[PDB]
Design a binder for these strands. Structure first.
Ligand SMILES: [Cl-]
Ligand SMILES: [Cl-]
Ligand SMILES: [Mg+2]
Ligand SMILES: [Mg+2]
Ligand SMILES: [Mg+2]
Ligand SMILES: [Mg+2]
Ligand SMILES: [Mg+2]
Ligand SMILES: [Mg+2]
Ligand SMILES: [Mg+2]
Ligand code: NA
Ligand code: NA
Ligand code: NA
Ligand code: NA
Ligand SMILES: [Sr+2]
Ligand SMILES: [Sr+2]
Ligand SMILES: [Sr+2]
Ligand SMILES: [Sr+2]
Ligand SMILES: [Sr+2]
Ligand SMILES: [Sr+2]
Ligand SMILES: [Sr+2]
Lengths: 95, 140, 154, 160, 186
RNA sequence: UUAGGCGGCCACAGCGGUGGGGUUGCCUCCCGUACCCAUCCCGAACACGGAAGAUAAGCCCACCAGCGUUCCGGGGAGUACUGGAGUGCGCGAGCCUCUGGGAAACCCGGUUCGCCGCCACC
RNA sequence: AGUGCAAGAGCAAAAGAUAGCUUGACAGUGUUCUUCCCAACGAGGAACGCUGACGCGAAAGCGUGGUCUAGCGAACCAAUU
RNA sequence: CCUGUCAAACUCCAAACUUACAGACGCCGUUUGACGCGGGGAUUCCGGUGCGCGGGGUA
C-alpha cells in the first residue's frame, strides 16, 4: 500500500450495498450472545462504533465474555490467538 | 361526501419582503396579530452578505383572523386565473397569500402516521377559483 | 468403487495434489488404491485427475489383481483364498472383491495393506502427457480400459 | 513511430481523462460517412470489414484506412453517392512513450488507440446491389493500412 | 420506486409509526418498555419485551376495559390515562414484571401530559420505572379537577350523554380505590 | 386485527391506479381552547377538553402490473470467464484439447400490488 | 446538500440546519487491538471497560473532542503541578 | 426516440477462486507422545529459473 492506516484498502468491505444504505435495524445491535457461541465478524458500514480492525472482517470467533456492552470474541489470526472487542451490531450467530 | 370535500382556508400569510423591519407595525395593524422576522440565506452581491438577519416579516392568519382580513383585503386585488397555483392556491400584491385546502388536510401536517394527501383530495385551480369567487368577488 | 493408480511422479506436482494422493494411501508410482464413490472422495480424485488413471474394474479383474498384489497389513504372508478365508469376513478373494466393489468394506478394514503395489504396464501404457479421450492414459477410464491397464500391471 | 510499439494489448486499460492530461486530439475526421441522413435499413447490401486478430489501432491508422476507403467510395459513387459507411470504433486507450535511462520511466502521453477484438466489425458499409463491388474495393484498401488481417464479410446480400 | 439504487425506508418508518433512533436507545436499557399510546377517544398501555420474531407484550391495559371495574366517564382524559396505566401496571406485576422504561413513541414529553400520567399510574402499581416527578401533572389534575372547574364555567353541561352534571374526580377515586385493592380480577 | 397497539424481515413491502367499508363499537377526519402544554407570529402543529357531523382523506378490506423490485421457466449459454493437466497449434500477441466449475446484458412467458410474530378486540 | 482540510467511506423524525443550554476537549486505572497481517519490537493511535466528578434530557440514553482513517517525538536536563 | 463507442483510480450485476469456523470421510497421534509449551545452538536477511497473474519499459 501507499499508506498504512487502519482503513487502507477498505473501500469495498466498508461500503454498503446501496439498498442497505442508511441507519441499520436496532434488533441486531441489541442481540445477546452467550459465552461459547460462534459468531461471524462483519462490520456494518452504517454503524460507526464498536468495530474491530477491518483486517478481521470474515472471521468466525467464539464469545468468551464481555466488556461493558461490547463482547470479547476469541479468534486465531493465522497462528496467533487474539481477543476482539466488538459490539453485537457487527456480529452474527453462526449456522 | 360533498361536506368533507368543500374547500376552506388553511392560512392567510401576509408578508413584506423588504431587504434590511420598520414595516412590522403596519402588518400588526392590517392583520391584527404579531408578525415575525424573516432571515435570508447565501451571501449576496447586493450588499447582502449577512446570512442571518432581518430582511422581511410575515403574519400567518387562520380561522377568523384570516377571513376578517380577506374581507377587506380581497377587494383590494383583481384576481385572475394565472394568479392561481396548481394546488389551488393564489396570492396577490406587500404580498398576500391564501392557502386553500380540503377538511382532513391535517393527515399531512400531524406528527404520527402522517401521510401525503392523494391528488384526488388535492384542491384544484378550478375548484379554487369557484369556492373563492363563490364569495365576494370575480374571476379572470 | 474406483481403482486409482498413480502414473505420474511426485517431482514438480503441486504439494496439495501430492498430499491428496498420500491421504488415499498412494506413495509411489504404479501403486493402486480402491476408493468408494462418495462426494468427499469424488473431490479428491478430480483433484489428482491429471496424475492418475482410475475407473471401476470388473469383478474378475479385481480378483486377479488382489490375488497377485494384495498384502497383509504387516508381514509377507501371501494372500490367497485360504488367507482370505482365515483372516477376513469372507470365504475367498471373490467374496472380498464383491464386498469391495459394493463398498461394504475396505482393504484396511479386512487387515490388508490399503495399497496394491502393481508392476509396470507390460507392453507399456498410452502415455502420461494426454488424457484417455486424446489417446493418453490419464484420467477416468472405461471398465474395459481400466481392466486393460490393471491386467497389464498385474 | 512504428505500430509494433503499440499494436498489442500488453498494458492495463488507460482511459480515465480525470487522471490523465495532455491527451492529443484524434486525427479521425468522421465516423459516419455517405448519406448520414438516410437509415441503414434503407439498403439491400450491408458489408463489414472484420478484424481477424485482437489488436490496438492508433487513431492515425483509423484515419488513414477510413480516408483511403471513403475516398474510393467517393471517387466511384460521387461526392453524394447513394451509400453510407460507418467507422464504429473510437480510440479510448491512451498511449505513452518513455522519451535518463529506466529511472522514473513512466512515459509521457503521445496518442490514442482503439482496442479491437478478433471477429469484430471495424467498418460497415451500406450500398445498393450495384455498388457492392466498389465497397469491397474500399475495404481492400482499408485493411492494407491497419495491422491485422481482415475478412470482408457480406451481411445482408444474397444477390450473387 | 425510482430505480434499482433507490432506497426505500423501513416499513415502520414510511408509515411514520416508529422512531428507530429512540427505539434503539430504549432497547439499550435491557428492561421491558411501558409502551404508552393514545387515540382521540382512548389510551393504551402495554409492557413490551424483545423477541426473536418481533416484540412481545407481557401485559397491557386499554381505557375501554376500564369500565369493567365501574367507569361510566369518557376515556380520553387525564383520569382515564392514569387509571389505565395503573391497570396495566397491576397486571404487569402479575406476570412477574418488576421494572420498565417509558416508551412514549411519537408523542411529545409535555409536562403533565397523559403519557406521563400513564407512567405515574404504572409506577403506583408498583412497577419500577425511571421517571421525574416535576414533569408529572399535579395530583388534582390527574383526578380530573381541571375538567370539573371547566364544567363549573357551565351554561351547557360539558358532557353530552349525562354521565353527570358537575362531573366527577371523586369517581376517579372510587375506581383507583377499586384497583389498588387486592381482590379485583386483573 | 368490521377498521387497533408494539414489532421482526426491511421494495416480493416502492410508484401509480380501481372498487368496497362504519348510529350509542374501533381508527380517523372532525368540534373546541378553561386548564397542563404550545407557537422566534399563528390551538396549523404540539398539548389538553370533547362528540354535532362524516366515511371525502387517512386507515382497513378486495383488486389491477404500466414503471421499479424478488424469485422462476425457456432462450441467450454450458456462451463469456475460469481452478488443474498437456513434447496440442501459432512467427508471435495468442489459441486449442481433457478435467472440475460457470456468469452478465437482453428477449419471451410466469411470479410479486408484502410475508411473519406478540398483545388486544363481536 | 451539508458535515473545517486529501481521498475513499458513513450519515435524513440524523452524524446535516436552527435555537437554547453546557464545558465529557474532565480526573484515576485498566482490557483489547493497532503500530509490527502471519510473528518479537517503542512512542503514538483507536475501540471497549471499572472508579470519581459533572453536563443535557421526562427517561432510556448520549458526552473518554471534531462521523471514520493524517495533524507526530526516547533517554539525560530544565521549568511546572 | 432512434443510432455509434468506453473505464487501473466506474458499478444495477457477477464468477472460477481465495479465505474464517464447524461437522463428516480420509491421513495422522496416544511404547515412533502428535498438537501445545519452555529452554540451548544456529545458519540466514546478494538469490535464480519455469509456469500462472501481474505493474513499468519499444524491448
Ligand atoms: Cl480489533
Ligand atoms: Cl400514540
Ligand atoms: Mg478493489
Ligand atoms: Mg508390508
Ligand atoms: Mg509416448
Ligand atoms: Mg371511498
Ligand atoms: Mg512454438
Ligand atoms: Mg540530547
Ligand atoms: Mg515548562
Ligand atoms: Na444500513
Ligand atoms: Na431576526
Ligand atoms: Na374514509
Ligand atoms: Na502504545
Ligand atoms: Sr506490459
Ligand atoms: Sr493488414
Ligand atoms: Sr381546529
Ligand atoms: Sr514477428
Ligand atoms: Sr454444472
Ligand atoms: Sr467519534
Ligand atoms: Sr487473492
Amino acid at each position: 500500500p501507499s499508506s498504512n492506516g487502519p482503513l487502507e484498502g477498505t473501500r469495498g468491505k466498508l461500503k454498503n450495498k446501496p439498498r442497505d444504505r442508511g441507519t441499520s435495524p436496532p434488533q441486531r445491535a441489541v442481540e445477546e450472545f452467550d459465552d461459547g457461541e460462534k459468531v461471524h465478524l462483519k462490520i456494518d458500514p452504517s454503524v460507526p462504533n464498536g468495530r474491530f480492525h477491518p483486517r478481521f472482517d470474515g472471521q468466525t470467533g467464539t464469545v468468551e465474555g464481555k466488556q461493558g456492552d461490547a463482547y470479547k470474541v476469541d479468534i486465531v489470526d493465522g497462528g496467533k490467538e487474539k481477543t476482539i472487542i466488538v459490539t453485537a451490531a457487527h456480529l452474527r450467530r453462526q449456522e | 361526501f360533498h361536506e368533507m370535500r368543500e374547500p376552506r382556508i388553511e392560512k392567510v400569510v401576509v408578508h413584506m419582503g423588504i431587504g434590511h423591519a420598520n414595516a412590522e407595525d403596519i402588518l400588526g395593524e392590517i392583520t391584527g396579530q404579531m408578525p415575525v422576522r424573516t432571515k435570508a440565506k447565501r451571501t449576496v452581491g447586493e450588499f447582502d452578505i449577512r446570512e442571518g438577519d432581518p430582511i422581511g416579516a410575515k403574519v400567518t392568519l387562520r380561522d377568523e383572523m384570516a377571513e376578517e382580513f380577506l374581507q377587506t383585503a380581497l377587494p383590494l386585488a383583481e384576481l385572475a386565473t394565472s394568479q392561481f397555483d396548481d394546488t389551488g392556491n393564489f396570492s396577490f400584491g406587500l404580498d398576500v397569500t391564501v392557502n386553500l385546502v380540503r377538511p382532513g388536510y391535517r393527515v399531512a401536517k400531524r406528527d404520527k402516521a402522517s401521510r401525503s394527501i392523494p391528488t384526488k383530495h388535492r384542491l384544484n385551480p378550478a375548484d379554487a377559483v369557484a369556492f373563492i369567487e363563490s364569495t365576494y368577488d370575480v374571476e379572470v | 468403487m474406483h481403482a486409482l493408480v498413480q502414473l505420474r511422479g511426485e517431482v514438480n506436482m503441486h504439494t496439495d495434489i501430492q498430499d491428496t494422493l498420500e491421504m488415499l494411501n498412494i506413495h509411489h508410482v504404479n501403486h493402486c488404491t480402491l476408493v468408494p464413490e462418495t462426494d468427499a472422495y469424488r473431490g479428491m480424485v478430480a483433484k489428482v485427475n491429471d496424475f492418475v488413471a482410475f475407473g471401476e474394474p470388473s469383478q474378475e479383474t479385481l480378483e486377479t489383481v488382489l490375488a497377485t498384489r494384495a498384502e497383509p497389513l504387516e508381514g509377507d504372508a501371501d494372500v490367497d483364498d485360504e488367507w482370505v478365508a482365515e483372516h477376513t469376513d469372507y470365504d475367498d478373494i471373490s467374496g472380498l472383491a464383491f464386498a469391495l466393489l459394493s463398498e461394504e468394506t475396505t482393504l484396511r478394514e479386512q487387515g490388508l495393506s490399503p495399497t496394491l503395489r502393481l508392476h509396470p504396464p507390460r507392453g507399456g501404457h498410452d502415455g502420461v502427457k494426454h488424457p484417455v479421450k486424446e489417446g493418453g492414459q490419464l484420467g477416468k477410464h472405461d471398465t474395459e480400459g481400466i481392466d486393460d491397464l490393471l491386467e497389464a500391471m498385474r | 513511430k512504428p505500430a509494433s510499439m503499440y499494436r498489442d494489448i500488453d498494458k492495463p486499460a488507460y482511459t480515465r481523462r480525470e487522471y490523465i492530461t495532455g491527451i492529443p486530439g484524434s486525427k479521425i475526421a468522421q465516423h459516419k460517412m455517405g448519406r448520414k441522413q438516410k437509415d441503414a435499413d434503407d439498403y439491400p447490401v450491408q458489408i463489414s470489414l472484420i478484424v481477424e486478430e485482437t489488436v490496438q489501432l492508433r487513431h492515425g491508422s483509423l484515419e488513414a484506412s477510413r480516408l483511403s476507403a471513403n475516398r474510393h467510395l467517393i471517387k466511384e459513387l460521387g461526392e453524394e453517392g447513394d451509400y453510407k459507411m460507418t467507422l464504429r470504433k473510437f480510440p479510448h486507450q491512451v498511449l505513452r512513450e518513455n522519451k535518463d535511462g529506466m529511472r522514473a520511466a513512466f512515459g509521457k502521453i503521445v496518442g490514442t488507440a482503439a482496442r479491437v477484438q478478433a471477429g469484430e466489425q471495424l467498418f460497415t458499409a451500406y450500398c445498393n446491389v450495384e455498388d457492392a463491388e466498389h465497397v469491397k474495393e474500399a475495404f481492400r484498401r482499408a485493411y492494407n493500412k491497419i495491422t491485422p488481417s481482415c475478412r470482408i464479410d457480406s451481411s445482408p446480400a444474397g444477390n450473387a | 420506486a425510482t430505480g434499482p439504487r433507490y432506497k426505500v425506508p423501513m416499513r415502520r418508518r414510511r408509515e411514520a409509526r416508529t422512531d428507530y433512533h429512540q427505539r434503539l436507545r430504549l432497547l439499550k436499557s435491557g428492561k421491558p418498555r411501558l409502551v404508552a399510546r393514545k387515540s382521540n377517544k382512548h389510551v393504551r398501555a402495554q409492557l413490551v419485551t424483545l423477541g426473536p420474531n418481533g416484540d412481545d407484550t407481557l401485559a397491557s391495559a386499554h381505557s375501554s376495559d376500564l369500565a369493567e371495574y365501574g367507569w361510566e366517564a369518557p376515556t380520553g382524559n387525564m383520569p382515564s390515562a392514569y387509571l389505565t396505566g395503573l391497570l396495566a401496571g397491576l397486571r404487569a406485576q402479575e406476570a412477574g414484571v418488576e421494572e420498565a422504561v417509558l416508551d412514549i413513541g411519537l408523542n411529545s414529553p409535555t409536562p403533565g401530559s397523559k403519557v406521563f400520567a400513564i407512567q405515574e399510574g404504572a409506577i403506583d402499581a408498583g412497577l419500577d420505572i425511571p421517571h421525574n416527578d416535576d414533569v408529572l401533572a399535579d395530583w388534582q389534575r390527574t383526578r380530573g379537577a381541571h375538567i370539573a372547574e371547566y364544567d363549573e364555567q357551565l351554561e351547557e353541561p360539558l358532557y353530552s350523554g349525562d354521565f353527570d352534571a358537575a362531573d366527577l374526580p371523586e369517581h376517579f377515586d372510587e375506581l383507583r380505590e377499586t384497583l389498588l385493592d387486592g381482590d379485583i380480577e386483573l
